[PDB]
Amino acid sequence: QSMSLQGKVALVTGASRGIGQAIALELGRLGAVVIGTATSASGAEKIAETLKANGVEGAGLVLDVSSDESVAATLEHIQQHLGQPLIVVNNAGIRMKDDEWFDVVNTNLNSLYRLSKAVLRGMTKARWGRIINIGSVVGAMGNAGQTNYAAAKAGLEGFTRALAREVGSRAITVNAVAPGFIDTDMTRELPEAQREALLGQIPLGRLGQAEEIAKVVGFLASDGAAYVTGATVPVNGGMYMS
Amino acid sequence: LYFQSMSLQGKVALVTGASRGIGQAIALELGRLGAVVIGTATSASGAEKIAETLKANGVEGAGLVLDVSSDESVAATLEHIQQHLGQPLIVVNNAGIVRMKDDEWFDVVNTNLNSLYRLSKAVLRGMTKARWGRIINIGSVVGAMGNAGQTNYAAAKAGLEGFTRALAREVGSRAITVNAVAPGFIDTDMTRELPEAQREALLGQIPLGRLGQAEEIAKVVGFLASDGAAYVTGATVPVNGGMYMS
Amino acid sequence: HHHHHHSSNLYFQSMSLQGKVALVTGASRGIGQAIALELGRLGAVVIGTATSASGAEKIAETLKANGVEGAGLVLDVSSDESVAATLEHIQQHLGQPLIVVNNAGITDEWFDVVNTNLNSLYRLSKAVLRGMTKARWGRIINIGSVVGAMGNAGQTNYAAAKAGLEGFTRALAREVGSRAITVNAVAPGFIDTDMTRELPEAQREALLGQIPLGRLGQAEEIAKVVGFLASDGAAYVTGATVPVNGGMYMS
Amino acid sequence: LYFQSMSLQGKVALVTGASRGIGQAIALELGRLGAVVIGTATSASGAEKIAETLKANGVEGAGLVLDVSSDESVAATLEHIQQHLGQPLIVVNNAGITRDEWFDVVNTNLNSLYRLSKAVLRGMTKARWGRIINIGSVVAGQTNYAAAKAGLEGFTRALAREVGSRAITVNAVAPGFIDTDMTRELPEAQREALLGQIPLGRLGQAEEIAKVVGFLASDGAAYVTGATVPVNGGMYMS
């Protein structure tokens, strides 16, 4: 179809669970060869098993997006065995305290930059690419959680717009998806009172599914989305936390 | 039952302002995805052009005359559809109303949002019954080069964003999503007639280095109409090649 | 009779508006009253408005008590007739308003409140523009209350309404800027009123937990921002929506 | 009604990047409002210029060398201030760091803001009062400007939320095109095009940024926190 990613290699960080897993499976459904990453060898192997179980061609790999050496080594590995990743989804991130938002957002954006700069060479050669950055999920307890959510989203939006402007003349798009309260391993077991309070602020009246984030990412990765760049797509059931 | 990503089989879609450009591209995309498409124009000749265009492309549906400024026209149009085709559960609003000046924004935005409210309120009854719907509001493209053009484009985009977010919040509990698509510079009649120097300057403000196609807007709409976009509501998706003006 | 116009060598340092005439709509209470008094502190001749004669008289009494020159007048910003007639009356008796603060509002509600209220901002703002154009100076300041872009009007409508107010304010600023008229908006958060004070303790506590400053804002704290925007020092600020919300930003 | 504090007597203000333009105007405005003003520059000659400018204008304070990119410079300078002048309770960050460059510029600059802000926040926490005001960079140009503004807004809002219970406000000012350095050399055709994008039809004055900062620093602005005030004559870039 026109949604096809056949012939494309995709790299999805943080793919062993939750949103990242769902992204990897959706890109695979669309025909990409998917490389999914975890911070451990056991995670990488699990990804491979998940991809097999779903008929997706690709691999699991160990990647630490905080490390220049890890990034360079991993990308060389991929280039030698699978091909140049032309679709890259930055999903891996590194109580919440009222004073740690800065180091979290700072670190995460430094990792987005690190990985993006590493993969842009291959996209620049191909004169095509998709870079999709995934924001953090709502749910963390406290005013500190709200603080961090909004701070991370603001970093994400700015970074994505800036990079999009930098690389657009190469037919590379750069977009973000900002999830709301999504059913993941991290939110499923939040205290009931908190889950109930969050649901009360969501017009749709339900958590989002990981797959509902992944469908958006799959669209953005498609040829149909070629004129969408610099955007942050909120996927939040109408709940806009700021 | 049937269950396939992207399919709009069994759904009836109403696309206002479907006789040319973006609206036509939307009607044909929805049709490609399997919807029965009713496209509308303010004139009989437009409606006929819609009907012919749908036929030529193997899309089931009809071209109808609708004036979104009129309560009577809206009620009559929805009755006609309900009797002959079924309840429209996908509604795409693209029917918006000597050099352009920077005092024209208010009339144009105000009129367009008041007509948008009218249409939306009318189609919500059916969607509420069905406990499912998609309302997709299409923004106005940049209509002139220079300041007035920017003033008027930003005002319309702001209005559209706020209206979309408010309506989404109102109707979300019914599993109806309400989203907007905000075009940038799209290849259309205005841009087709620009001088080279002006085109070149314009393309320099666009990171992708090119105008958008109507079909690039239509693809985003098609996605938003799908089951996969069920958790996207109250959003304005910009489709502008990286050219952000507010 | 119901009468509809009620009138109100010590040089305070605060006075910088030199007897400029300011029109503050919805000045009977709360934020509008505070704005009227603030502009008086800054040396304007202050016309505060209400929709009833009793409100106009209350405003006049408040201005008198505080030593501010001006008047309380009846104005209905929803009415073309009222706006035209009232502006003419002001021009004849007091002078041309060069500072206009839109604080009167109304409160399908999700659409009609914002729609009605932006139509009213446009009506009054267009009316006063002739005078400001002649003077080649003006200040138009929109209070977010009028569309419900005020925390006290509640979370449900807030962010969508503020997006309307912001876009409208920025467009009008673009339209009238060549005339040295600025157009700005103030978006208040939760402000201390009888209504928020009569909240139960648990509910007040929950509310304060959403506010980093840990307290409701005072009406005077909104008025001081408006006063600044009306000043010469704010001449390069235009098209801005200034949130005044203690760090509680609803989206 | 007519009496209160909208002035800054008895307060100490630190204005980083005070030797020229916007920073100098900020320093003078805070001085006019009655603050004791410490202005900083990256060089001894800059510090001397500050000190001379303050003196010429009857403002008490000092000109000091500060490198906001350096942990050592920030700690040494703040210690020096605390011992000789007092605790700065109004801090205006206008010092920029020079550095495909938008990422490093925004990243370096927010790392600097965070550094300086953490350093000064102890004193404000003791006083149970403070004002932090972050100045954005004035107007590829669009890309860099908007990125620096986006970083700035989110950073400011987050720090505001962290410190608000202490009665410390944190706000930003986002200037548009201001009559300083760069614009003083633009070709006429470019100036004319630029002015056409500005509804007021003129560049801003440094003093017009400084008056906004002066207001934010006042008691009257006590409920404004987390805000980025655009001061751009109606020229908005996103």
Coordinates of C-alpha atoms in Angstrom, one line a residue, chain B residues 102-107 110 113-114 117 121 150-151 154-155 158-159 161-163 165-167 169-170 246, chain C residues 108 110-112 115 118-119 122 126 156-157 159-161 163-164 166-172 174-175 251:
Chain B
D102 CA -4.7 42.8 7.6
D103 CA -8.2 44.0 8.8
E104 CA -10.1 41.1 7.2
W105 CA -9.2 38.4 9.7
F106 CA -12.0 38.9 12.2
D107 CA -14.9 38.6 9.7
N110 CA -15.6 34.6 13.0
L113 CA -16.1 29.2 13.2
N114 CA -19.8 30.0 13.5
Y117 CA -20.2 25.2 15.1
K121 CA -23.6 20.4 16.3
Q150 CA 0.4 36.2 7.6
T151 CA -2.0 38.0 9.9
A154 CA -2.3 33.0 11.9
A155 CA -5.6 34.3 13.1
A158 CA -5.4 30.1 16.2
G159 CA -9.2 30.1 16.0
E161 CA -6.9 25.3 17.2
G162 CA -8.9 26.7 20.1
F163 CA -12.3 25.7 18.6
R165 CA -9.6 21.6 21.4
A166 CA -12.9 22.9 23.0
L167 CA -15.2 20.7 20.9
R169 CA -13.3 18.1 25.2
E170 CA -17.0 18.4 24.9
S246 CA 1.8 32.3 14.2
Chain C
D108 CA -23.4 25.2 23.8
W110 CA -18.2 25.8 25.3
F111 CA -18.7 27.9 22.1
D112 CA -21.1 30.7 23.0
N115 CA -17.7 33.5 20.7
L118 CA -14.6 37.9 21.3
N119 CA -17.4 39.6 19.3
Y122 CA -14.0 43.4 18.7
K126 CA -13.1 49.0 16.8
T156 CA -12.8 22.9 31.6
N157 CA -12.9 25.7 29.0
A159 CA -6.9 26.5 27.5
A160 CA -9.1 26.4 24.4
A161 CA -10.5 29.8 25.4
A163 CA -6.0 30.1 22.6
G164 CA -8.8 32.1 21.1
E166 CA -4.4 34.9 22.4
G167 CA -4.9 34.6 18.7
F168 CA -7.5 37.4 18.6
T169 CA -5.2 39.7 20.6
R170 CA -2.2 39.0 18.4
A171 CA -4.3 39.7 15.2
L172 CA -5.7 42.9 16.5
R174 CA -1.0 43.4 14.0
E175 CA -3.8 45.3 12.5
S251 CA -3.8 23.5 28.9

